[PDB]
RNA sequence: GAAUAUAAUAGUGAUAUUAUAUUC
């Protein structure tokens, strides 16, 4: 049955007003959605019918809402359907939309179908419901859909538009430093969604506050490790490496992001290093590549060491040199691997010493010990920045004798689609189903979760380990511990993290006050302001087009970034669906080898079968993948794996995305 | 009359069942009514041929008067005589008969301590119920702890006869310097042992109600930077170095300016210059006086630097201007004239630097930003602003009144009573007058204050609290929340020192430990807890039973003025009144001092303050003590802190802070002489 | 607080040590005057000596208010402030309490009782006595008794020092004086009763006083009575139906006070009717009692109907016949109730028509409408004579749609101590604290307040609905509307009321004139005249029966049943009367007391009633006295009968019953 | 239970009746 504050939140929407509904995470948004949809569909007369679309930007939420909606609206004469990438191709989208009254949808589907024209107008819908509507900004699919919406609204405008509902726990305030800037941001968000009302709980605050409780937050400022002999050894290793790199080619503190941002630039600048003798250029470029890569890995190791155990860093390095040893053994790689193996002894000697322990981990252990001593039934979630740090802390917990009461579990993202990393959806679902009080896992170590997501087991202890986020995620993560007495511990040694979190707190205050102020305005006047903002933003958006770079028709050569080997020419390149890039000719097929794809999935009219690597003298550089497009079995490459050196001027240039590499892109033809 | 909220009955329940109890609940939840419930039930529980006698302990006169009034109006109907005894009504009255002929007695704990000590009240068995307001003060050498020492001594000792039930009232028991759960539990258990408490009562079954009555304000942390360019500091520092050189050029002598380190140093140096020896001894007077003047001016300059660092340069410069204004109109002095003119030299440059808007304190700017924002969002905002010193109070009032951007503010002042023998602070009827004007429809919009002892009387609710460079304990942290019980109240901690923020965070974690420890203790069996606190009591008593006097000195000494080293009197002339106060005999001493009418004439003990006495030699005007009417005698009373002790024989000069540390042949005052 | 100049002026004679009567308008702040006088008085004494003040308040609210104010004020100066009232008077050492305190707030009756006892042997223990509302110092009032002690010590050979005497009032009164001479006589006699030699009034600061206390403008409203008389017709022949019924049992201008007096006399005459057959005497006497009671109730209903709605009277009778039932079945009660129930229809038909309205209620409604239309923020106070009229006008206001803007509250006395009527003190405090501008109530219906009392919310509109009073009450009521623009409306249908209020105004003139004339006299001469009046009054006061030892029977006044014999009666504390033996225990039933109070050494537990065949006539109460649980009876509930002669006599008070009164003894 | 005051109505008045309020 409906809680009164849910009816309160749904009321403005039930009156047909475009509404941004803002309420605490876990107060029950699903049911509000159900109310709004029900009322909306039942309001039409006989000769007319309604059609609702529900946007969820995550597959688990998509499936959940699809399930609940179909189970709920079955009794009523309303057909519910769902569409995602898993079921998107060779299906008549327009028919599915037309033959159903409720459509749960990944926004990208609607974007693609709007662009391709299969869905000519949003007038087909009478109600659009954006889950996590705060994402309606910039180049997000939500904002694309609303760009279509507003383009229709401010344009010829002769077709009718659907009602718009947004759901969120925080509208955000941007980089606002005062209430008026925050108010401006909020008004612009309302404009992006064409919203005239922001709905919040006011008359039922008691009811809401005996369902959702705000966890008590604590700040923990510890200090760095005063002694780091580990860093003293690794530093010498790194400067030996860059000394070798300096020796081969004659043209910032270690363990920092600055050194990483530097070494990435250096590696990017060594790739374009050119010589008349191509062999020597190849040798030197590959050598510098390996050098910069090793340096990067050493830096990563230092970072891991400062954020966790020395053993975790040393194991990271061990697995890296394992990586390298397995992937062909080169003489310079032999030199570097050696160069790690003399110091390996001293490193393991330093790491085994209890003297050199991270105080951050000691404080974390102190918190865990205290809380679980007070309550052995404690359910904990532990957020960190990187997956390496996830595994690191898992090993630390499983290793620490004083934490034997903990049963650690892991929760990371899917990782990159073309890399054997991350974690599949069924694995996540498995560990999450295992993560209960009656389950196997006691504490869940995780990186980060996009928005609210599916409700998991309630955690009476949240720990933010060197964790930085915005105000939105700050408000959202409260949903992890809704039970009264829940605690959140921000643990760090950066001081700036603390200030950041406090700034986010003040930003929450600004947001709430701005909402309160905005709600006192007259709706008509606010609609006028909204329209003005929409016209303003549309003008700025249309003015920002600037399309003009003339496609270079002079044929260029693509050289492997690692070994500078000639992959192919731009003349051989064909573009499929204006997005993907393949190569024709039997010549190119002998320039690469293939290995079975780690994460095979049928994206678009493609079917990943394998990853392709450089074949030239053990290079094994990632060039792209191999797919089964329609009737053809063809390779697909990425420009960030090559170097554009054109025949004439002979100057090498780097591109990260094909959208920036302007040349005579020839469309793909089956008759070729 | 009213009607008890459920959680109030829940809090009162262990007490009504006769258990010794510490009631711990948020500030403003309504403790007076809980007290009334407990007292009413307690008194009405006795049969016909018996009667109860309740004593209530408030350690503040306002709370004393409040509780006296409330209990009087409440229990008069039920036929229970209510009375009270404060320091103002404790002398020349039969305390024993007053306690005997009343059912409820509101009391300042010191009255009971002194009357137990004298024997006018032979035992606590006369009471059947003792209530300690702000019971967390029951520790160390606090009067509460003295009373409970008497109580416990009667308990454990062969002493018997019935002991009264003991109730304590607080919002926070504290955890002391605990670092974890076990230490916090140790501390809390030791407090329960101090109060002989077997039960800690909190709200559990009616949390929703309480939360609908008392809301926790949202706390924000504001870290800002200090001013970076400070010419004021440079000029003042140069003045300080000049004064130091002047001090060195007169006497052979042997940290940074604007710190507590410099303050400790200059105090040490002043005290050291006081024991400077010369054979001439009339040049000793000149040199010592000069050094005293120099060190005093240096101290004032340092204070100026600090005020400047926490406020406007104008505030510091006005502080100095007021200081030299006090130096003037006191009398002419070559040294004082020299220093004054040395200040008047740099005065122009100082004023020009002080008027430049490019040197505004960013802390005051952020404060102004906060006030502006919150009053823009709600012009009916009632604000309370806590600062460290009274100088900063005055400074911030002046700043607010002098700031056009804060024209919507109507600042009021709230400070302590100040030292009893100085014309500073603020009188109680003044605090009352200002607090009564501190309303939404009153004359004042924002209240600038130093600090408050515990909770105190309920003033107007503030939806905005601002801690300006403020550092307190977990108890005061929890207590100050009562200033904003309403939903939506906000508290801003504004500082430029990260240690402050960190300290408040530590306090929050300490609150967590306190709550968790209490929750843990509440699960224990009552008998086990009784046993544990009994063992703690027995141990602490065993320690206290033998935790040693020293021998006096019969050799006659001299008391010289610390400023001018002039002979005031000999220790042979000194008599001791009531083992605490010290007077001088002989008509010789009468020619050594001048006097002015006392700024705060109050009757302490058997004395009545009439005047303050000062050194008379060559307009020294150094504070020696006071002049009072004790019994029938009009006599002076002096503090040892004003003099230096020079032994006749050895010639050694020594300093003593308290008379209790000055071990000499203390002759008792005798009216027969 | 900083003193206003007229307060310093009024206080000045007292601070000079003069026995003074301070007379100034209500609301000018007499509390701070008292504080000034007390502060100066206590602080004037040298070191080796000390002063002691006693403050007299005749009301518990004033008592507690003054106790609190004096406590808060004088605590810091070093003076212990205490108080004693009836609630805290028993089993406490009064002498020690007085001795160990500097300022004692007191209900005068406590001092009277302790003076009579001997615990306080003399008034010499006090150095200053202050009488709040000193105009009460007359006749057999507690103030006057205290002053009888005072003056008996003064004029007597007692050389002991007497305390300075201060009185506080807004009107000294003039009695029934017809001219300035008699007024001056009376005022001089009051000054003699208080031993005052000075009357302090504002003179040099009248302009200051008149800007703090404004005199409200009075208006006189003479309206017409009920021209209609149908309701009265019905109830009238109902009354001679009942009168014929009563006349058909034994031998021998409705809606008036004379008829009420007469029917009371008739009931009290029927109570002594005797016969050979005592049972038929019982039946007949009970009959006559019931009939007379019904007649009385009908009369009361008529009065209510003339001063209010017919519906109010009909509801009064309805409530009456509602309480006649649930008390028990009586043949005659059933008869009468039937005789009423048959005409109920016509009565309500008459009470429903809108052509039936009291012109007085319409005029009051017009006044309220005009005043609240001119000012909706109006705070009205409406005085009536009876609580029945209070409830009646409350119902009339809440019923009338034209008075929708009104939020009527109630303010009555505490009623008789042994009845389920009136209103408790905390209830009074509740409604009063609700009666504010921004409160729950706009208009407050009330009967009468003892003197000035505690300051309530300022009423810019005061209405006297058929309400006469003396000059003192007239002057005091002005305190209800001190703000400029305050109005008073004397609404009535009698020329008597208006004429007596005008007479009161003239009496105020006489009073002020007499005072101003007295203030010109030499103080020595005035003291001589005062001493003269005091000596005369003492001579008169020190002016000049055998108890019938024959046993008597106490019969129930209603059913003539035997309660007890006078031989069984014992007297406690020379005032109360109890019964011994197990026999009397079979004669009465009891109900738990509606107002359990702890007066004296007694604690009220229950009311007691006649038990024989559901007579239920109030005989008295049942109390806890020390260790014993005993009945206490009132003689006005019984008919006395002599054993030998058989005479039947009535007594309204025990002190008028001169029989052999045996002192109660625990050893029996 | 008792005491007290005010007002109205009877009586020349002492006083009495009712109403109202207060107190122990
Ligand atoms: Mg009547
Ligand atoms: Zn390659
Ligand atoms: Zn001196
Ligand atoms: Zn009877």
Nearest to C105 by CA among C78, C135, C80, C137: C80
Which nucleotide across the nucleic acid strands is nearest to C472, CA versus C1'? Answer: D6
> How many Å does it take to go from CA C240 to C1' D20?
30
Q: How is residue A515 written in tokens?
A: 């909402």
Q: What is the three-state SS of C150-216?
A: HHHHHHCCCCCCCCEEEEEECCCCCCCCCCHHHHHHHHHHHHHHCCCCEEECCCCCHHHHCCCCCCC
**Contact A417/B at CB under 8 A:** no
Q: What is the three-state SS of A122-149?
A: HHHCCEEEEECHHHCCCCCHHHHHHHHH
**Where does chain B hold its CATH 3.40.50.300 domain(s)?**
1-215+525-550, 216-228+361-524
Say yes or no: Cβ of C112 under 7 A from any atom of strand D. no
* Cα separation, C553 vs C157, whole angstroms: 49
Nearest CA in chain C to B90: C78
Give yes or no for a contact between A581 and A574, defined as CB atoms under 8 angstroms apart: yes
CA of C298 to the centre of ligand 1 (A): 10
Q: Spell out the alpha helix ranges (H) of B384-473.
A: 390-401, 428-436
* Cα separation, B625 vs B615, whole angstroms: 10
Class of domain B551-673: mainly beta
* Cα separation, A392 vs A305, whole angstroms: 10
CB atoms within 10 A of CB A315: 18
Q: Which of B 354-383 lie inside 8 A of A, CB atoms? A: 369, 373, 376-377
Distance from CA of A219 to the nearest CA of B (A): 6
**Where does chain A hold its CATH 2.170.150.30 domain(s)?**
550-672
Strands B633-638, B199-201: pairing kind: unpaired
**Contact B208/A at CB under 8 A:** yes
Provide φ and ψ at B14, rounded to 5°.
Answer: -65, -35
* Cα separation, C147 vs C191, whole angstroms: 11
> How many Å does it take to go from CA C55 to C1' D24?
18
Kindly state the DSSP code that residue B358 receives in the 8-state scheme.
G
Return the half-sphere exposure (C-beta side, CA atoms, 13 A cut-off) of residue C518. 31
Provide φ and ψ at B584, rounded to 5°.
Answer: -120, 140
Listed in sequence order, the residues at least 6 apart from C167 whose beta carbon sits closer than 8 Å to its beta carbon are C20, C21, C22, C130, C131, C134, C135, C137, C194, C196
CB atoms within 10 A of CB B580: 10
Q: Which residue is nearest to nucleotide D5 (CA to C1')?
A: C141
* Cα separation, B23 vs B13, whole angstroms: 10
Query: CATH for C546-668, among 2.60.40.10, 3.30.565.10, 2.170.150.30, 2.40.10.120?
Result: 2.170.150.30
Contact positions of strand D to protein Cβ (< 7 A): 1-10, 16-24
How many contacts (CB atoms, under 8 Å) link B and C?
A: 58
Return the half-sphere exposure (C-beta side, CA atoms, 13 A cut-off) of residue C593. 20
Q: How is residue C474 written in tokens?
A: 């007239």
The ligand placed nearest to the CA atom of residue C297 is 1
Sign, CA torsion C655/C659/C664/C665? positive
Q: What's the CATH number for B229-360?
A: 1.20.1320.30
Strands C552-556, C638-642: pairing kind: antiparallel
**Contact C93/B at CB under 8 A:** yes
CB within 8 Å: B211 and A216: no
**Where does chain A hold its CATH 1.20.1320.30 domain(s)?**
227-357
Say yes or no: Cβ of C600 under 7 A from any atom of strand D. yes
> How many Å does it take to go from CA B35 to C1' D3?
38
Give yes or no for a contact between C407 and C442, defined as CB atoms under 8 angstroms apart: yes
Three-state secondary-structure class, residue C231: helix
**Contact C68/B at CB under 8 A:** yes
**Where does chain C hold its CATH 3.40.50.300 domain(s)?**
1-214+522-545, 215-227+358-521
Three-state secondary-structure class, residue C221: strand
Distances (CA, A) of B318 to B301, B325, B407: 12, 10, 22
> How many Å does it take to go from CA C362 to C1' D6?
30
Give yes or no for a contact between B165 and B18, defined as CB atoms under 8 angstroms apart: yes
The ligand placed nearest to the CA atom of residue A612 is 2
* Cα separation, B52 vs B131, whole angstroms: 13
Nearest CA in chain B to C91: B101
A579 is in an annotated binding site: no
Provide φ and ψ at B643, rounded to 5°.
Answer: -125, 165
Kindly state the DSSP code that residue A494 receives in the 8-state scheme.
-
Distance from CA of B106 to the nearest CA of C (A): 13
CB atoms within 10 A of CB C589: 15
The ligand placed nearest to the CA atom of residue B289 is 3
Give yes or no for a contact between B557 and B645, defined as CB atoms under 8 angstroms apart: yes
* Cα separation, A403 vs A398, whole angstroms: 7
* Cα separation, A429 vs A60, whole angstroms: 9
The CATH homologous superfamily to which domain A550-672 belongs is RIG-I-like receptor, C-terminal regulatory domain (2.170.150.30)
Give yes or no for a contact between B187 and B175, defined as CB atoms under 8 angstroms apart: yes
* Cα separation, A313 vs A321, whole angstroms: 12
Nearest to B232 by CA among B352, B125, B152: B352
Three-state secondary-structure class, residue A506: helix
**Where does chain C hold its CATH 2.170.150.30 domain(s)?**
546-668
Phi-psi region of A44 (alpha: psi -120 to 50; beta: other; left: phi over 0): beta
Three-state secondary-structure class, residue B644: strand
First to last CA, chain B: 59
Architecture of the domain whose range is C228-357: Up-down Bundle (1.20)
Q: How is residue C502 written in tokens?
A: 């005008």
Say yes or no: Cβ of C576 under 7 A from any atom of strand D. yes
Burial class (CB in 10 A: 0-12, 13-18, 19+), B544: exposed
Chains near A (3 or more Cβ pairs under 8 Å): B
The yes/no answer on whether domain C1-214+522-545 falls in CATH 3.40.50.300 is: yes
* Cα separation, A601 vs B103, whole angstroms: 86
Distance from CA of B170 to the nearest CA of A (A): 21
Nearest to B217 by CA among B512, B479, B490, B470: B490
Q: Per-residue b/e over B386-403, b at no fewer than 16 CB within 10 Å? A: bbebbbbbbbbbbbbeee
Distances (CA, A) of A437 to A278, A429, A444, B464: 63, 16, 12, 41
Give yes or no for a contact between B417 and B475, defined as CB atoms under 8 angstroms apart: no
* Cα separation, A625 vs A609, whole angstroms: 8
The yes/no answer on whether domain C215-227+358-521 falls in CATH 3.90.180.10 is: no
Give yes or no for a contact between C153 and C161, defined as CB atoms under 8 angstroms apart: no
Please give the torsion angle defined by the CA atoms of residues B331, B335, B337 and B339, in that order, rounded to the nearest 10 degrees: -130
Q: What's the CATH number for B216-228+361-524?
A: 3.40.50.300
Phi-psi region of C539 (alpha: psi -120 to 50; beta: other; left: phi over 0): alpha
**Contact A236/B at CB under 8 A:** no
Return the half-sphere exposure (C-beta side, CA atoms, 13 A cut-off) of residue B142. 18
**Contact B97/C at CB under 8 A:** yes
Give chain A positions within 8 Å (CB) of B494: none
CB atoms within 10 A of CB A461: 22
**Where does chain C hold its CATH 1.20.1320.30 domain(s)?**
228-357
Distances (CA, A) of C251 to C240, C245, C273, C280, C286: 16, 12, 11, 15, 16
Q: How is residue C122 written in tokens?
A: 């003399």
Give yes or no for a contact between A333 and A324, defined as CB atoms under 8 angstroms apart: yes
Kindly state the DSSP code that residue B173 receives in the 8-state scheme.
-
* Cα separation, A391 vs B20, whole angstroms: 53
Q: What is the three-state SS of A371-413?
A: HHHHCCCCCEEEECCCHHHHHHHHHHHHHCHHHCCCCEEEECC
> How many Å does it take to go from CA C598 to C1' D24?
10
CB within 8 Å: B512 and A218: yes
CB within 8 Å: B101 and C92: yes
Three-state secondary-structure class, residue B74: helix
B79 vs C71, C80, C87: nearest CB: C87
Give yes or no for a contact between B494 and B367, defined as CB atoms under 8 angstroms apart: yes
The yes/no answer on whether domain A214-226+358-521 falls in CATH 3.40.190.10 is: no
**Contact B180/A at CB under 8 A:** yes
The ligand placed nearest to the CA atom of residue A328 is 2
Sign, CA torsion B70/B72/B76/B78? positive
Which nucleotide across the nucleic acid strands is nearest to C110, CA versus C1'? Answer: D24
Architecture of the domain whose range is A227-357: Up-down Bundle (1.20)
Say yes or no: Cβ of C135 under 7 A from any atom of strand D. no
Q: How is residue A514 written in tokens?
A: 């701005």
Tell me which residues from 532 to 561 on chain C have a beta carbon below 7 angstroms from nucleic acid strand D: none
Q: Spell out the alpha helix ranges (H) of C308-386.
A: 310-324, 331-341, 344-350, 359-374
Strands of the sheet with C638-642, listed across from one edge: C562-565, C552-556, C638-642, C648-650
* Cα separation, B227 vs B308, whole angstroms: 10
Q: How is residue B307 written in tokens?
A: 């005020």
- In which residue are the tokens 């780690």 written? A598
Give yes or no for a contact between A609 and A597, defined as CB atoms under 8 angstroms apart: yes
* Cα separation, A176 vs A594, whole angstroms: 50
* Cα separation, A573 vs A668, whole angstroms: 9
Three-state secondary-structure class, residue C547: coil
Burial class (CB in 10 A: 0-12, 13-18, 19+), B117: exposed
Q: What is the three-state SS of C591-651?
A: EECCCCCCCCCEEEEEEEEECHHHCCCEEEEEEEECCEEEEEECHHHEEEEECCCCCEEEC
Provide φ and ψ at A92, rounded to 5°.
Answer: -70, 95
Give yes or no for a contact between A284 and A249, defined as CB atoms under 8 angstroms apart: yes
Optimal mutation site among B210, B216, B365, B376, interface A, most CBs of chain A within 10 A: B376
Say yes or no: Cβ of C51 under 7 A from any atom of strand D. no
Provide φ and ψ at A61, rounded to 5°.
Answer: -65, -35
Q: What's the CATH number for B1-215+525-550?
A: 3.40.50.300
* Cα separation, B619 vs B327, whole angstroms: 12
**Contact A205/B at CB under 8 A:** yes
The angle at the Cα of C542, spanning C536 to C543, to the nearest 5 degrees, equals 100
Q: What is the three-state SS of B424-437?
A: CCCCHHHHHHHHHC
Provide φ and ψ at A658, rounded to 5°.
Answer: -65, -25
Which nucleotide across the nucleic acid strands is nearest to C267, CA versus C1'? Answer: D17
Nearest to B62 by CA among B555, B452, B329: B452
Q: What's the CATH number for A1-213+522-549?
A: 3.40.50.300
- DSSP states of B300-312: HHHHHHHHHHHS-
The total number of residues written for chain A in this structure: 672
**Where does chain B hold its CATH 1.20.1320.30 domain(s)?**
229-360
* Cα separation, B381 vs C58, whole angstroms: 45
Q: What Å resolution does this PDB entry report?
A: 2.6
* Cα separation, A362 vs A309, whole angstroms: 11
Q: How was this structure obtained?
A: X-ray
Three-state secondary-structure class, residue A272: coil
Optimal mutation site among A173, A179, A201, A514, interface B, most CBs of chain B within 10 A: A179
First to last CA, chain A: 63
Kindly state the greatest CA–CA separation across chain C.
84
């Amino acid at each position: 049955k409906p809680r009164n504050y849910q009816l309160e939140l749904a009321l403005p929407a039930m009156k047909g007003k475009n509404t941004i509904i803002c309420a605490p995470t876990g107060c029950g948004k699903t049911f509000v959605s159900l109310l709004i949809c029900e009322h909306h569909l039942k309001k039409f007369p006989q000769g007319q019918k309604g059609k609702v679309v529900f946007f969820a930007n995550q597959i688990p939420v998509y499936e959940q809402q699809k399930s609940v909606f179909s189970k709920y609206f079955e009794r009523h004469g309303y057909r519910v359907t769902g569409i995602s990438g898993a079921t998107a191709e060779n299906v008549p989208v327009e028919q599915i939309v037309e033959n159903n009254d409720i459509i749960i949808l990944t926004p990208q589907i609607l974007v693609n179908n709007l662009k391709k024209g299969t869905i000519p107008s949003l007038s087909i819908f009478t109600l659009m419901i954006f889950d996590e509507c705060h994402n309606t900004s910039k180049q997000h699919p939500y904002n694309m859909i609303m760009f279509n919406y507003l383009d229709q609204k401010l344009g010829g405008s002769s077709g009718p538009l659907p009602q718009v509902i947004g759901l969120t726990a925080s509208v955000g305030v941007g980089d606002a430093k005062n209430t008026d800037e925050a108010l401006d941001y909020i008004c612009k968000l309302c404009a992006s969604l064409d919203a005239s009302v922001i709905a919040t709980v006011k008359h039922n605050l008691e009811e809401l506050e005996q369902v959702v409780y705000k966890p008590q937050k604590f700040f923990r400022k510890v200090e760095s490790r005063i002694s780091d002999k580990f860093k003293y050894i690794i530093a010498q290793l790194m400067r030996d490496t860059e000394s070798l790199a300096k020796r081969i080619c004659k043209d910032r503190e270690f363990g920092t992001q600055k050194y990483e941002q530097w070494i990435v630039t250096v590696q990017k600048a060594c790739m374009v290093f050119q010589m008349p003798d191509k062999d020597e250029e190849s040798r030197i470029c590959k050598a510098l590549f390996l050098y910069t890569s090793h340096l990067r890995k050493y830096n990563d190791a230092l970072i891991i060491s400062e954020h966790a155990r020395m053993k975790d860093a040393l194991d990271y390095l061990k697995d890296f040199f394992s990586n390298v040893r397995a992937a062909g053994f080169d003489e310079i790689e032999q030199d570097l691997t050696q160069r790690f193996e003399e110091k390996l002894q001293e490193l393991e000697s330093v790491s085994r010493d209890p003297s050199n322990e991270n105080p951050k981990l000691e404080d974390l252990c102190f918190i865990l010990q205290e809380e679980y001593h007070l309550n052995p039934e404690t359910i904990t979630i532990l957020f960190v920045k990187t997956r390496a740090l996830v595994d690191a802390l898992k090993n630390w917990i499983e290793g620490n004798p004083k934490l034997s009461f903990l049963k650690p579990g892991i929760l990371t993202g899917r990782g990159k689609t073309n890399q054997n990393t991350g974690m599949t959806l069924p694995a996540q679902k498995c560990i999450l189903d295992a993560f209960k009080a009656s389950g196997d896992h006691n504490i869940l170590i995780a990186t980060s979760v996009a928005d609210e997501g599916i409700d998991i087991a309630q955690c009476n202890l949240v720990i933010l380990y060197e964790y930085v986020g915005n105000v939105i995620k700050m408000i959202q993560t409260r949903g992890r511990g809704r039970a009264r007495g829940s605690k959140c511990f921000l643990l760090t040694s950066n001081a700036g993290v603390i200030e950041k979190e406090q700034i986010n707190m003040y930003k929450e205050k600004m947001m709430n006050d701005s909402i309160l102020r905005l709600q006192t305005w007259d709706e008509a006047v606010f609609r006028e302001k909204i329209l003005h903002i929409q016209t303003h933003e549309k003008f700025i958006r249309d003015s920002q087009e600037k399309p003009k770079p003339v496609p270079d028709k002079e044929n260029k050569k693509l050289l492997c970034r690692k070994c500078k080997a000639l992959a192919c020419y731009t003349a051989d390149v064909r573009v499929i669906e204006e997005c993907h890039y393949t190569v024709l000719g039997d010549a190119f097929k002998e320039c690469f080898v293939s290995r079975p794809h780690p994460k095979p999935k049928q994206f678009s009219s493609f079917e990943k079968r394998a990853k392709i690597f450089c074949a030239r003298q053990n290079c094994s550089h990632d060039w792209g993948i191999h797919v089964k497009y329609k009737t053809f079995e063809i390779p697909v490459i990425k420009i960030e794996s090559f170097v554009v050196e054109d025949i004439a001027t002979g100057v090498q240039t780097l591109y990260s995305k094909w959208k920036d590499f302007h040349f005579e892109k020839i469309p793909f033809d089956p008759a070729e």
